Amino acid sequence: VAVQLQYDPVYDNADQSFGTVACSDGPNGMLTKGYSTFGSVPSYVGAVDTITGWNSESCGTCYQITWSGTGKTIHVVGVDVAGNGFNVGQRAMDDLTNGQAVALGNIDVTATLVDKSACRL
């Protein structure tokens, strides 16, 4: 309660390497956890402001995120530093907003840290 969300179409890039983000290698990084690219994770991925830098203990955490606008929920795996709230893919925001990612650009959402398994990790 509540938290900014915006979209970066980088997180829709299946081939974006986990090398390019804070959550790259090291024990918490997604490379180490066996994901080479964003598309190898069975979840939307995003930056979250709980990740502050490389090898963040928050790297690879899972957020259940809800938008009061549609009441829809998505799961996002935090893999990069966000300044404020979440930056997710457009697919991820489109999901949340029933296709108003481009039109709204930023929404306020509600998010909860949940078991990794909720993001299929």
Side-chain angles (χ1 to χ4, degrees), residues 2-3 6-7 14 33 63-64 67-68 80 94 109 113 116:
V3 134
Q6 21 177 13
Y7 83 94
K33 292 167 168 163
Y63 296 82
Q64 171 204 291
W67 190 42
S68 291
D80 203 9
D94 272 339
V109 298
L113 179 72
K116 202 176 48 134

Side-chain angles (χ1 to χ4, degrees), residues 16-99:
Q16 180 76 16
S17 177
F18 277 111
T20 64
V21 297
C23 299
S24 55
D25 57 358
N28 297 321
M30 301 298 290
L31 299 168
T32 310
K33 292 167 168 163
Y35 306 100
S36 170
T37 61
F38 287 182
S40 63
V41 179
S43 183
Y44 297 125
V45 299
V48 64
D49 60 22
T50 49
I51 295 166
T52 62
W54 182 81
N55 198 52
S56 175
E57 210 77 12
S58 280
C59 273
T61 46
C62 177
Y63 296 82
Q64 171 204 291
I65 307 185
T66 307
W67 190 42
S68 291
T70 53
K72 280 189 80 179
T73 299
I74 59 164
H75 291 87
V76 175
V77 178
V79 303
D80 203 9
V81 177
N84 186 47
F86 291 99
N87 314 316
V88 301
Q90 190 190 308
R91 281 249 310 174
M93 192 177 274
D94 272 339
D95 193 331
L96 267 178
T97 61
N98 275 334

